Design a protein around this ligand. Structure first.
Ligand SMILES: [Mg+2]
Ligand SMILES: [Mg+2]
Ligand SMILES: [Mg+2]
Ligand SMILES: [Mg+2]
Ligand SMILES: [Mg+2]
Ligand SMILES: [Mg+2]
Ligand SMILES: [Mg+2]
Ligand SMILES: [Mg+2]
Ligand SMILES: [Mg+2]
Ligand SMILES: [Mg+2]
Ligand SMILES: [Mg+2]
Ligand SMILES: [Mg+2]
Ligand SMILES: [Mg+2]
Ligand SMILES: [Mg+2]
Ligand SMILES: [Mg+2]
Ligand SMILES: [Mg+2]
Ligand SMILES: [Mg+2]
Ligand SMILES: [Mg+2]
Ligand SMILES: [Mg+2]
Ligand SMILES: [Mg+2]
Ligand SMILES: [Mg+2]
Ligand SMILES: [Mg+2]
Ligand SMILES: [Mg+2]
Ligand SMILES: [Mg+2]
Ligand SMILES: [Mg+2]
Length: 92
RNA sequence: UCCAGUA
RNA sequence: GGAACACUAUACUACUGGAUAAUCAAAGACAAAUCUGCCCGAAGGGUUUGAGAACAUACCCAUUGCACUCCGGGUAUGCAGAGGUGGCAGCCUCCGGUGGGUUAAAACCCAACGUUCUCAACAAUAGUGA
């Protein structure tokens, strides 16, 4: 079910955290307000990202018209976050 | 190994 | 440069070039100034070396992983950041290589950024200066 935050994996793992962060914000902003965007390069969390929209509809729109996008030479695999983000839970 | 310049 | 005040000389360390006549030369940050706030100490001042750790950058092996506290293994690299007397924050200035503005081109201006911690060793000798 639809959720403010989207989960993206299959990201290029050779890309630095700073770079990936601005590059994600640049292609997703055109869909709505973005509270924050979580990115780690751990063993467990690499290749993936979380993008938090302020509106649930923005998430949905982004998921749909961006799925499979060639992001850094690698199709994106956007899906909904299985759980709500901290920023959102401690907000509403 | 020595010598100078520089720091 | 020469390491707990300052300068000089010596030892000594790094870069560059040279062979006793040792060329000529390149190169190069502690220059100016001594800031504001809070905090800690009995005392605020390291251009040394090393060992750990973390961090960053390259590749290599693994990894398709649903998180919101950093955090897989490995080889190689780091030897540029500086001054403002401890720490954190900020501000001022310098040095550096980037990105903009300005120019005919430079200046000049703007901005962001630059390896940290812990431990151990060393911080000499001569002269001079309070
Ligand atoms: Mg100097
Ligand atoms: Mg000297
Ligand atoms: Mg001296
Ligand atoms: Mg020495
Ligand atoms: Mg000259
Ligand atoms: Mg000087
Ligand atoms: Mg001096
Ligand atoms: Mg001075
Ligand atoms: Mg005091
Ligand atoms: Mg006191
Ligand atoms: Mg003293
Ligand atoms: Mg000093
Ligand atoms: Mg799982
Ligand atoms: Mg590693
Ligand atoms: Mg290493
Ligand atoms: Mg050395
Ligand atoms: Mg460096
Ligand atoms: Mg102070
Ligand atoms: Mg400071
Ligand atoms: Mg500059
Ligand atoms: Mg220009
Ligand atoms: Mg012009
Ligand atoms: Mg120019
Ligand atoms: Mg700085
Ligand atoms: Mg001494």
């Amino acid at each position: 079910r639809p959720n403010h935050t989207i989960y993206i994996n299959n990201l290029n793992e050779k890309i630095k955290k700073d770079e990936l962060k601005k590059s994600l914000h640049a292609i997703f902003s055109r869909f709505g307000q973005i509270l924050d965007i979580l990115v780690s390069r751990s063993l467990k969390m690499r290749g993936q990202a979380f993008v938090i929209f302020k509106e649930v509809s923005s998430a949905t729109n982004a998921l749909r018209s961006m799925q499979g996008f060639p992001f850094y030479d690698k199709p994106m695999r956007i899906q909904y976050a299985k759980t709500d983000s901290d920023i959102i839970a401690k907000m509403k």
